[PDB]
Amino acid sequence: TIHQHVDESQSSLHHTEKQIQTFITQHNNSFQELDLTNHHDVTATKRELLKLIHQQPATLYYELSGPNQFITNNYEHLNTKNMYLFSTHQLKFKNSTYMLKIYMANTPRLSEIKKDNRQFALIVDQYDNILYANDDRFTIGEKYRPQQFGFMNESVKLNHADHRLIIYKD
Amino acid sequence: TIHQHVDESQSSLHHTEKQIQTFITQHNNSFQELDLTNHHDVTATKRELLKLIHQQPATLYYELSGPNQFITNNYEHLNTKNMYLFSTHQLKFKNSTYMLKIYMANTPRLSEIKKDNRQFALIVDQYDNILYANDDRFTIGEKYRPQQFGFMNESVKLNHADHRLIIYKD
Amino acid sequence: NVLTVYSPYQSNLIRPILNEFEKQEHVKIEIKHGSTQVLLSNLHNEDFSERGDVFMGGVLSETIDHPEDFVPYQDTSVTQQLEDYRSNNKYVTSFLLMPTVIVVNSDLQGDIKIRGYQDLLQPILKGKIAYSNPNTTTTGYQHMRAIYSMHHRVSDVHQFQNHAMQLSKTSKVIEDVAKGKYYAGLSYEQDARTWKNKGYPVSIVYPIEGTMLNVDGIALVKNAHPHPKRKKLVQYLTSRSVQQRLVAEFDAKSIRKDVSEQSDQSIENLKNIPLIPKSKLPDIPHHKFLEMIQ
Amino acid sequence: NVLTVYSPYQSNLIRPILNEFEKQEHVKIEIKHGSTQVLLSNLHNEDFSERGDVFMGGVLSETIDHPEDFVPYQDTSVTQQLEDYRSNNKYVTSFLLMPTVIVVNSDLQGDIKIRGYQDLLQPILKGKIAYSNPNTTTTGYQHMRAIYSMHHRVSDVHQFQNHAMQLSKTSKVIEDVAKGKYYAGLSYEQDARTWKNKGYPVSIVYPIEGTMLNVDGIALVKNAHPHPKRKKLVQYLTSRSVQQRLVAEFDAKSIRKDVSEQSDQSIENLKNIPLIPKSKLPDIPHHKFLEMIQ
Ligand SMILES: O=P(O)(O)OC[C@H]1O[C@H](O)[C@H](O)[C@@H](O)[C@@H]1O
């Protein structure tokens, strides 16, 4: 049911965020010794980043930016404005600090219920700003006003931020 | 003597410039098939660039700039502001256009007469802007005025630009 | 709880900066949109206990017919505002400078010349000009004044109104001129830039005869239980850092002395616009003028 | 072949843009630097056939004692210049707006207050203030007018001159203040900004009692064989794109209506500077005033 889908999604995103934090902790004592102008160390960063992406059912895209470097697995160059921003980190990389952004484009679960059940998903912050939408009626950056709409919905707070996941129908 | 040294240096830089034209031509049909986001093709460009750097006696530094790429053999990060800008090129690299700048820091002939003869060098354009100096009393980007100029000197036009090589004694 | 704001501004201008205030002060801000005078009329009939807290946008210093619906106030920052546009009304704090413009479709214009209001009267442009109801909108009313201020003839206003199609909403003028339904229209800078930046064939004309400059205001609404953050909002909107932003990010024209303008791309700087001076600016109050021209 | 230019400006301001003119018109431009009045005297005694072609910089509309040494001329662009600063002199075209400022060493300042000419008279600051010879420089002379215009008392000019050290060159004032040899000095905006940007502990003060604003000019020099490109140079320096240059790259204040100002740091925009109005602006001519404060 919808209530089951939000619990499972919340728990899955929590596990996901949990793994990101584990990644950043582990490798802090591994980055300070890597140089991202060296093609052997860049390969080492991609391998670890892609390893993380695929320990997860959710579809995630990383952006590692800094001085004359842009590293990502968004090979088709999808617009990040339509994706959920999951986290952000500043990593010390010997030669400079590089910013790491993790984006969530979709989940196999949310993609499945949207296809089979027409149950859509929203993520909103405490001021009703829309941070994620797979329904074309809503667009990220705008406001979600629940009163304008009549839907079945169940919502839940996510552990990693003051955000609410909303799964709804109609 | 001075007149000998201008001819030999004027001839060395013509030969040098001649070799860079040949490079740019040879690989107009080679570079259009390389992608500088791929670490095998970057190595292919560096190998060709460093081969060029060492086919001639002058000390040269290349800068290949573009979208999230900066490639150079200026590993100690010397200030290019003190180097003779010598040629510029826009190259088509499949994924984008990259600007290639070639800088001359010194030549073994000018370094030699500076040490053995105290003969220094200037390169100036038709408006007397200084484009190169190995004498600390002149600085690139400023002007040289042959009024205040009180030295022994011979000058010659360089083939590749409206520039003049001046070797002078103090 | 929720801090409600009445505004005729388009969301794309005020929503981003109010958002920055929401998560700076931990407040929810709701915006009630609509034409200036429609909001003021709906507000007037609204119960004291159901009224919002703040009104921003519109030429408030000159078109509030019901002062009793507002609280006297002026921010401490008026000292840093441009002397000529400081509010001399105790209910309104000045907030932005907004040129009113003529917007021209450059695909349709051809060789027709549109340099001001008189050119809009070329018989070839009859039925192909749009404007917004001067009774309900700040934009239509301010344009009618400027038309009147050309030669101070009410016949000029009527000749235009017979020559042009009246619309209900200011934002409908630029949209329909931008999409090629009208050759030109009367609008405002900030809504014309908006449509021009999306790629539409929109030319911004500052009328030579004279350009009306709108001094947008902010006013506290008189209600039963005012929101405790609402005075912080007024101080926030008149702060330097927010003005600098409005300038930098939206090309708005700031009310403050200490905020310089920004550079070109079809939005002229103030000193290069042909503004109606204090001299030729008609004197008549709001309701009088609407009745005079109807 | 060579197009010679007299300028009191520092090279770091004019050499780059004049270089761009050399490349665009295929001309060699030589600059003859010096204090404003020294150049005008050297020029006056200079033989007709050895005179340069162009004079740029200094308050030319107010301090040329020998009009016959120049050719009347004003560019076609005066139409686009700010009304209040258009030159009413047929030999001078207006080029830039340059505030005169007090520069304070913030390492030495401590808690002393410096907000104007009157504060420079605190006995603690005796012998620790620097300024440039008003007989030879535009900067000293324009500051003496500003000191005089406070309360129109020649005693104020003399009290300052007794209180401060006079220097031969304007550029020596900011240099020595910046390096900690003087607590404060009387300079102008661009020279202070130059040193502030290099990292020196320099605070720029616009005197509250009334800031003098210099309207820099450009004038054609009367000589035997004027360079054929010198009128192209004047149009170039007053052009919108070059002015947009002086603004973006150097923080200069443009003379044109259609060039906006720039949001810089610790440099104020014109509308936030306490300028002396044309009202209180002393009248007496240059030579007269100088003889009066001797
Ligand atoms: O014309 P309205 O529908 O009343 O909208 C009014 C808007 O445009 C006017 O020109 C004002 O300058 C703006 O401050 C206001 O946001």
Ligand SMILES: O=P(O)(O)OC[C@H]1O[C@H](O)[C@H](O)[C@@H](O)[C@@H]1O
């Ligand atoms: O040494 P000077 O004659 O004062 O030259 C420096 C002058 O350059 C510019 O023209 C400024 O407008 C003057 O305020 C400044 O004083």
